Amino acid sequence: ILPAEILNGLVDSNWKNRLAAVEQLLGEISGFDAKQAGISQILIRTISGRKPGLKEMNFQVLKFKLDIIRSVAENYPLTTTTVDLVINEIIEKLADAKNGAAAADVLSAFAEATKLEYVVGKVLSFAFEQKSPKVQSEAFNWVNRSIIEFGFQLQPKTLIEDVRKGVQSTNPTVRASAIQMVGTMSMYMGKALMMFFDSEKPALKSQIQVEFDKNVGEKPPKPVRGV
């Protein structure tokens, strides 16, 4: 369904043709057959399944590759299977200075095209298996914002268990991002949420309580996504 002239451009040694081929693909990503079976998978496979795929060396080609994956999610029926295939690489890019925001918008499109629950689970699960603190905190930052955007469409029990791990990080940036997420959760879950943290070390508990105080009386924004 792609002509070899785009397919070839995509694997060109010259990043300038890859840029063209990618952007080319991106410009027309709009109007493939939304009823073709597995069209979403075919299109996302074309960017991820080749080489170097999402191991792009050129930051700008990568940027537009992320943009393709996002657009496919927005425009076509997406399976959790297609998400599984690429999401871990996307999550890793959360810590990329230049491409982090574009990786996050892929995650958001994945969540809207499937379910927030499914993607948050995959995101936090991988963030913890993985071992860079920046990916961890950036993952909490994304889940935080997604709760604001989608509403609390999550299971509180496991979510509290996840943010508990982050709140007990030796890394202060991860801690702060997890604690901030507690703040956001309190807008949906109420004062009772604080009881799940009532037995943390004084220092930590004090920090959580501060953020909890700033948020628990606040009325949450109407969801802007997933509606």
| Token duo for residue 109 | 């499109």
Q: Which residue has the tokens 């925001």?
A: 101
| Token duo for residue 151 | 């509403």
Experimental method: X-ray
1-227: CATH superfamily: Leucine-rich Repeat Variant (1.25.10.10)
- Determine how many CB atoms are found less than 10 A away from the CB of residue 213: 12
CA angle centred on 106, ends 102 and 111, rounded to 5°: 145
Indicate the angle between helix axes 59-75 and 100-113, nearest 10 degrees.
Answer: 10
| Token duo for residue 181 | 């997420």
Instruction: State this model's resolution in angstroms.
Output: 2.3
- The whole-angstrom distance between residue 53's C-alpha and the CA centroid of its chain comes to 18
* C-alpha–C-alpha distance, residues 59 and 29, integer Å: 20
| Token duo for residue 15 | 């990043």
38-58 burial, b at 16+ Cβ within 10 Å, e below that, comes to ebbbbbbbbbbeeeebbebeb
- Determine how many CB atoms are found less than 10 A away from the CB of residue 16: 13
Q: What is the DSSP letter of 132?
A: -
Q: What type of residue is 96? A: D
Long-range pairs for 222-227: beta carbons < 8 A, 24 or more residues apart? 223/149, 223/150, 223/151, 224/149, 225/108, 225/111, 225/112, 225/146, 225/149, 225/150, 226/111, 226/112, 226/116, 226/149, 226/150, 226/151, 226/153
* C-alpha–C-alpha distance, residues 198 and 100, integer Å: 34
Q: What type of residue is 62? A: L
